Design a binder for this molecule. Structure first.
Ligand SMILES: [Zn+2]
Length: 216
C-alpha cells in the first residue's frame, strides 16, 4: 500500500499496521517514518525543506485525520531538519539531542528541542520508540531509532542501502569511527527484523554489514 502526491515527489508506504515509511525527492530520495498512534501522528525526520515538509504533514494529517504531534530529528542535515520552521509554527515538537540542536543552529536552521539523551524511550499512545546515539559516523550527531514492538531499526544515513556503493557526503563525517558506531548498534540490538536506510529500500541487518563493508 503506497500513496503519492500528484507530482510523485512525496510517497508513503506501509510497513505494517501503524508504521509507514515516507519518502521525499529533493532528484535525491530521503526516508523517514510516519507512526500512526492513538494520540496522533509521530514522524521520524522531516523533509528537505519547508515546502516538502508542510506538504508531507498535510498529506498524512488528511489521510489519518489526526495531527502530527512530534518529530524525531536524527541529525542536522537538510534531508532531516530542513522543515524545522514548519514544525514549530504548527506546534509540532522537534525532538533532538543537544548536539543536534547546536549543530542545527550552526547550520542556519532553527533549533530543535535538544531533549534526547544517549538512550531515550518515548511512548506515544501504545507506540514505543527508542532513540540511540551510537557515536559519530555519517555525521557527529547522528542517532538511530528503534521500534521494540516491531524490531524495526531506522538507521538513517548511518546505514546505506543495498545497491549503494557510495557513502555520500563525508566532509562532515567521521569515516574511521563510523565502523565502531555501527558495531554499537549491532551489539545493542541482537534481533533486528527490518532496517530503514536513510536513502533506499527497506532491508534487514545485512544493510549494516554492507555499510561496514563499504567503510573498510
Ligand atoms: Zn546527512
Amino acid at each position: 500500500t503506497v500513496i503519492k502526491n500528484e507530482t510523485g515527489t512525496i510517497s508513503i508506504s506501509q510497513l505494517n499496521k501503524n508504521v509507514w515509511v515516507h519518502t521525499e525527492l529533493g532528484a535525491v530520495p530521503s526516508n523517514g517514518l510516519v507512526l500512526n498512534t492513538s494520540k496522533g501522528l509521530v514522524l521520524v525526520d522531516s523533509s528537505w525543506d519547508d515546502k516538502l515538509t508542510k506538504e508531507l504533514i498535510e498529506m498524512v494529517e488528511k489521510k489519518f485525520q489526526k495531527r502530527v504531534t512530534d518529530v524525531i530529528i536524527t541529525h542536522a542535515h537538510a534531508d532531516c531538519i530542513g522543515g524545522i520552521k514548519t514544525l514549530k509554527e504548527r506546534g509540532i515538537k522537534a525532538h533532538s539531542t543537544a548536539l543536534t540542536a547546536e549543530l542545527a543552529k550552526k547550520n542556519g536552521y532553527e533549533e530543535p528541542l535538544g531533549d534526547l539523551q544517549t538512550v531515550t524511550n518515548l511512548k506515544f499512545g501504545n507506540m514505543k520508540v527508542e532513540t540511540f546515539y551510537p557515536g559519530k559516523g555519517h555525521t557527529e550527531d547522528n542517532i538511530v531509532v528503534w521500534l521494540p514492538q516491531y524490531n524495526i531499526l531506522v538507521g538513517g544515513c548511518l546505514v546505506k542501502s543495498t545497491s549503494a556503493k557510495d557513502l555520500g557526503n563525508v566532509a562532515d563525517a567521521y569515516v574511521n569511527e563510523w565502523s565502531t558506531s555501527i558495531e554499537n548498534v549491532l551489539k545493542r540490538y541482537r534481533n533486528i527484523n527490518a532496517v530503514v536506510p536513510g536513502h533506499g529500500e527497506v532491508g534487514d541487518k545485512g544493510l549494516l554489514l554492507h555499510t561496514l563493508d563499504l567503510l573498510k
